């Protein structure tokens, strides 16, 4: 199966900056600002550019211990960034891999919007337990938040 599940949200931070922050350097910023969500992130293969394979670790207690995503494409000018969950966590049996795409658009008022796909490649045709679609939304929710705050409190950061 291949069920998409888009999403959206707004932020004050201009796309430009938020992109650099939340995406580009985000994977080392997260254990800093959102300690209860992400324990630590490490580059299993690659130096962090396109193709890089990351092992994201979770604080003892949460549902999963780790998860490996894979940077797939990174458009710098348009702030589009794709990647794929491929091992550990939601992955297994029912789920094969989750492709994701995050695009950041600069609204006229200066702020911005984050669109977010989530094709869940399922085995044959089992279903997407609303469970996941739920967490994936909150997981990424808090994170965007934790960064918005930080970004705000440290105005000289990320440009």
């Amino acid at each position, epitope marked *: 199966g291949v069920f998409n599940y888009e999403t959206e949200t707004t932020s004050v931070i201009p796309a430009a900056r938020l992109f650099k922050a939340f995406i580009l350097d985000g994977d080392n910023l997260f254990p800093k600002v959102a300690p209860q969500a992400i324990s630590s992130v490490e580059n299993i*293969e*690659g130096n962090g550019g*396109p193709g890089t*394979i990351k092992k994201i670790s979770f604080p003892e207690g949460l549902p999963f211990k780790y998860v490996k995503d894979r940077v797939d494409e990174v458009d710098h000018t348009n702030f589009k960034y794709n990647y794929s969950v491929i091992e550990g966590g939601p992955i297994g049996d029912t789920l094969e891999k989750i492709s994701n795409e995050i695009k950041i658009v600069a609204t006229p008022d200066g702020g911005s919007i984050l669109k977010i796909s989530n094709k869940y490649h399922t085995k044959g045709d089992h279903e997407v337990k609303a469970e996941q679609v739920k967490a994936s939304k909150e997981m990424g929710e808090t994170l965007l938040r934790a960064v918005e705050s930080y970004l705000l409190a440290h105005s000289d950061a990320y440009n």
Partner: antibody
Amino acid sequence: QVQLQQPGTELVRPGASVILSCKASGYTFTSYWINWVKQRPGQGLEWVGNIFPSDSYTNYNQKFKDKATLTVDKSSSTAYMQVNSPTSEDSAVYYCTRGARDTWFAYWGQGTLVTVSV
Amino acid sequence: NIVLTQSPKSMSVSVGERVTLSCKASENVDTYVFWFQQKPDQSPKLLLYGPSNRYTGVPDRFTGSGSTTDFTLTISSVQAEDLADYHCGQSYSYPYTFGGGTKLEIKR
């Protein structure tokens, strides 16, 4: 151990299909990318393209877009780079590589020398 | 499609000497740069993975630095072994590209 095994030589008649095999070992094949780089006698290196086994996702350098074709066989855990309609411009050595913790190209296959000739 | 430019095309120094190679990219690549050391009749070897970072093995005679657009590999005191063709690569954007290489030649 963690090795990329590949034939030392390949001779092919111009315009014949050339298959480059690269067999992994020592690591979980489907957990790592395979980057193919080609190099002609006393020349700079050239990124050919990459391919993540498991879901066989791939990226090709433009220059080879339609010449080359990467693929893999999860069962025998080995990857193949296929060249179509070879020519002297193609005679060169081809390395399949695997990166590691914080880089690419940490491990290199022996390199295969393709010679396109009658 | 980025372009890594290496200069000079070659260098000649005496064993014990100090040398520094340069790699300049057509854009910012941040830190997605790395160096290879290819001796005669050998597949390239990962020298500096990421600027200023010696990969497993590589002796402390090797070091490097940079970010943004200009990078450099430097050998404090060249040996007779260090005779090789030194390379550059970036994985900032796809396609990954390489420097043309800069051959290190010993004088005696």
